[PDB]
Design a protein around this nucleic acid. Structure first.
Ligand SMILES: [Zn+2]
Ligand SMILES: [Zn+2]
Ligand SMILES: [Zn+2]
Ligand SMILES: [Zn+2]
Lengths: 89, 85
DNA sequence: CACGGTTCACGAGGTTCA
DNA sequence: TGAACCTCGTGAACCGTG
């Protein structure tokens, strides 16, 4: 269906919210990288499939608000223990 | 395509507008200095690739008249925090 | 299939130096 | 001023396990 962050074509659930592939990734990177973003405008930017790269603060706050969750992102160790298991197959 | 300010060949989007490399820089430099310009002639020079730099006031105007947003310029703070790594 | 991650080409922000 | 260059954030493709 539709991405709950930017409106774009969703591709399924990601981190617990219906989203597109861009926002799936923006959300994982942003949380892992612990980025802190700051809106250049008013803090209530209207996110769309085309302007979403313009306000990260608003995009990120939106992800969290529609329900996306960091706890679903793997930790480095979980990834490692996981690379080890695919590389043991 | 073509630069929305001078007609030069644009290099991609810049501050949210299709623009050449020079107008890109001119915009960012002006805004980072708040630089206010005045125009030596009337107040509507026709900006071209050639003259382009003879009227700062009219150019910066046209820049804004086509979308370029000073908000997309990195803040002294962000330009810094980031300037570390 | 669903949904975690990884790969890699590409856009757009800033910087250098003539 | 602006050509040329350095960076890294993006997202389309794609891999792998549950
Ligand atoms: Zn989205
Ligand atoms: Zn915003
Ligand atoms: Zn131009
Ligand atoms: Zn003028």
């Amino acid at each position: 269906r539709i991405c709950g962050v930017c409106g774009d074509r969703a591709t399924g659930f990601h981190f617990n919210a219906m989203t597109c592939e861009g926002c799936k990734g923006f959300f994982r990177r942003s949380m892992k990288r612990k980025a802190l973003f700051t809106c250049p405008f008013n803090g209530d930017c209207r996110i769309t499939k085309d302007n979403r790269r313009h306000c990260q603060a608003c995009r990120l706050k939106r992800c969290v608000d529609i329900g996306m969750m960091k706890e679903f992102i793997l930790t480095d160790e979980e990834v490692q223990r996981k690379r080890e298991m695919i590389l043991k197959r």
